[PDB]
Amino acid sequence: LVSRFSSNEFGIFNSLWFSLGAFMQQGDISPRSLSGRIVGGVWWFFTLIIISSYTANLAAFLTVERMVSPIESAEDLAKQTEIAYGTLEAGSTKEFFRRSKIAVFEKMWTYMKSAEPSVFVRTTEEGMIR
Amino acid sequence: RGVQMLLTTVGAFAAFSLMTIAVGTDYWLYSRGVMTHSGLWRTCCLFKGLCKQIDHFPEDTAEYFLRAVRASSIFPILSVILLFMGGLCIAASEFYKTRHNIILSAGIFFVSAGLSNIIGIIVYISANAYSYGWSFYFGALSFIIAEMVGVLAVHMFIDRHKQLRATAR
Amino acid sequence: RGVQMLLTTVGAFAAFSLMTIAVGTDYWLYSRGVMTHSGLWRTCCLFKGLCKQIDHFPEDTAEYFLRAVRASSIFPILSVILLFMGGLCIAASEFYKTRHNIILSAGIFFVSAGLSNIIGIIVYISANAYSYGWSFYFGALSFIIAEMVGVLAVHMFIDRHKQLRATAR
Amino acid sequence: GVFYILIGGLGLAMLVALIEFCYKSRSESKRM
Amino acid sequence: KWWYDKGECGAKDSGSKEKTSALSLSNVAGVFYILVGGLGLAMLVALIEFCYKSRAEAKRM
Amino acid sequence: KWWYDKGECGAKDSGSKEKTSALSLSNVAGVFYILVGGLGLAMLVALIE
Amino acid sequence: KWWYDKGECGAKDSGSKDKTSALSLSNVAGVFYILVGGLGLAMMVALIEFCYKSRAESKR
Amino acid sequence: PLAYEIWMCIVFAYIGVSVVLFLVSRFSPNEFGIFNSLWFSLGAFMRQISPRSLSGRIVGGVWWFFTLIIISSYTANLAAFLTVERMVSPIESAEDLSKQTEIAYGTLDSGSTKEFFRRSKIAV
Amino acid sequence: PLAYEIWMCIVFAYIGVSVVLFLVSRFSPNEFGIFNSLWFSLGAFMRQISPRSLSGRIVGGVWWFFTLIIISSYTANLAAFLTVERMVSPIESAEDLSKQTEIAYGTLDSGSTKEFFRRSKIAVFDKMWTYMRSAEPSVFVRTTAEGVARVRKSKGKYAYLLESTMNEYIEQR
Amino acid sequence: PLAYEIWMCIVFAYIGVSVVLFLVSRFSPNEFGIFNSLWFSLGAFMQQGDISPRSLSGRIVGGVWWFFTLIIISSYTANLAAFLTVERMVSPIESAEDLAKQTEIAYGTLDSGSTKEFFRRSKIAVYEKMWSYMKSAEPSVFTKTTADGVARVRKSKGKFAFLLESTMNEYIEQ
Ligand SMILES: O=c1[nH]c2cc(C(F)(F)F)c(N3CCOCC3)cc2n(CP(=O)(O)O)c1=O
Ligand SMILES: O=c1[nH]c2cc(C(F)(F)F)c(N3CCOCC3)cc2n(CP(=O)(O)O)c1=O
C-beta separation of I50 from I19 below 8 A: no
* Residues belonging to chain J with any Cβ–Cβ distance to chain A shorter than 8 Å: 47-48, 78, 81, 85, 125
Concatenated DSSP letters for A53-107? HHHHHHHHHHHHHTS-----SHHHHHH-SSS----BSSSHHHHHHHT--SHHHHH
Amino acid G30 reads G
**Is I47 in CB contact (< 8 Å) with chain H?**
yes
C-beta separation of C150 from J23 below 8 A: yes
CA distance linking residue C37 with residue H62, whole number of Å: 37
Concatenated DSSP letters for H44-104? HHS------SSSHHHHHHHHHHHHHHHHHHHHHHHHHHHH------S--SSHHHHH-SSS-
Candidates C121, J30, C1; CA nearest to J22 is J30
Burial class (CB in 10 A: 0-12, 13-18, 19+), C156: middle
8-state DSSP, I122? -
The C-alpha angle I134, I139, I143, rounded to 5 degrees, equals 140
The answer to whether the Cβ–Cβ distance between E36 and B115 falls below 8 Å is: yes
Amino acid C165 reads R
Smallest Cβ distance to B126: which of E25, E36, E40? E25
Smallest Cβ distance to I62: which of D10, D17, D21? D10
Chain C interface, best mutation among J27, J34, J68, by max C CB count within 10 A: J27
CA distance linking residue I117 with residue I127, whole number of Å: 9
Give all chains having 3 or more CB-to-CB distances under 8 Å with chain E: A, B
DSSP alpha helices (H): ranges in chain F? 26-48
- For G1, the closest chain H residue by CA position comes to H122
Number of helical H runs and strand E runs in chain F: 1, 0
The CA-based diameter of chain D, rounded to the nearest angstrom, is 46
CA distance linking residue C24 with residue I114, whole number of Å: 56
Residue B51 has φ and ψ, to the nearest 5°, of -135, 145
Quick one: which atom of ligand 1 is closest to the CA of A93? Answer: 24
CA distance linking residue A79 with residue I48, whole number of Å: 51
Bridge partners (DSSP) listed for residue G43: none
* Total number of residues shown for chain C: 169
CB atoms within 10 A of CB C95: 6
CB atoms within 10 A of CB H60: 22
Q: Pick one of 2.40.30.10, 1.20.1640.10, 2.60.15.10, 1.20.140.150 as the CATH number of C3-165.
A: 1.20.140.150
First to last CA, chain H: 35
CA distance linking residue B122 with residue E36, whole number of Å: 10
The answer to whether the Cβ–Cβ distance between I50 and A62 falls below 8 Å is: no
Q: Tell how far the Cα of I163 is from the centroid of ligand 1, in angstroms.
A: 28
CA distance, residue J174 to nearest chain G CA (Å): 5
H112 is in an annotated binding site: yes
**Is A83 in CB contact (< 8 Å) with chain B?**
no
First to last CA, chain A: 64
Quick one: which atom of ligand 1 is closest to the CA of A88? Answer: 24
**Ligand 1 in reach of A81 Cβ (< 6 A):** no
Question: In sequence order, which residues have a C-beta less than 8 Å from that of residue J147 and are 6 or more positions away?
Answer: none
The C-alpha angle E2, E7, E9, rounded to 5 degrees, equals 145
Q: What is the resolution in angstroms?
A: 6.5
Burial class (CB in 10 A: 0-12, 13-18, 19+), I64: buried
**Is A6 in CB contact (< 8 Å) with chain B?**
no
At I115, is the secondary structure helix, strand, or coil?
helix
Quick one: which atom of ligand 2 is closest to the CA of J112? Answer: 24
**Is H55 in CB contact (< 8 Å) with chain G?**
yes
Judged by CB atoms within 8 Å, which residues 12-71 of I form the interface with D? 13, 16-17, 20, 24, 27-28, 53, 55-56, 58-59, 62-63, 66, 69-70
Bridge partners (DSSP) listed for residue J159: none
Concatenated DSSP letters for E1-47? -TTTTTSS-----SSS-----PPPSHHHHHHHHHHHHHHHHHHHHHH
Quick one: which atom of ligand 1 is closest to the CA of A95? Answer: 23
8-state DSSP, B74? H
Candidates B29, H88, B122, B31; CA nearest to E26 is B122
For β-strands J160-162 and J106-108, DSSP reports them as: parallel
Q: Name the method of structure determination.
A: cryo-EM
Residues of F in contact with J103 (CB under 8 A): 9-10, 14
CA distance linking residue J81 with residue H80, whole number of Å: 6
CA distance linking residue H26 with residue H34, whole number of Å: 9
H3-38 in b/e form (b: 16+ CB < 10 A) is: beebeeeeeebbeebbebbbbbbeeeeebeeeebbb
**Is I79 in CB contact (< 8 Å) with chain A?**
yes
Touch J-B: 3+ C-beta pairs under 8 A = no
CA distance, residue H74 to nearest chain G CA (Å): 10
CA distances from residue H9 to A48, C16, G27, G28, H6 in whole angstroms, order as listed: 19, 48, 14, 10, 5
The C-alpha angle J164, J166, J167, rounded to 5 degrees, equals 110
With residue J15 as reference, give the H or E element that holds it.
helix J6-25
H64-76 in b/e form (b: 16+ CB < 10 A) is: bbbbbbbbbbbbb
The answer to whether the Cβ–Cβ distance between J66 and I46 falls below 8 Å is: yes
Smallest Cβ distance to A103: which of J48, J78, J125? J125
CB atoms within 10 A of CB J29: 13
C-beta separation of B115 from B19 below 8 A: no
CA distance linking residue B156 with residue B162, whole number of Å: 10
C-beta separation of C11 from C19 below 8 A: no
C-beta separation of H66 from G35 below 8 A: yes
For atom 18 of ligand 2, the residue with the nearest CA is: J113
CB atoms within 10 A of CB J1: 19
Helix axes C134-168, J6-25, angle to 10 degrees: 10
- For J167, the closest chain G residue by CA position comes to G3
Say how far residue B162 (Cα) sits from the centre of its chain.
30
CA distance linking residue I159 with residue C56, whole number of Å: 27
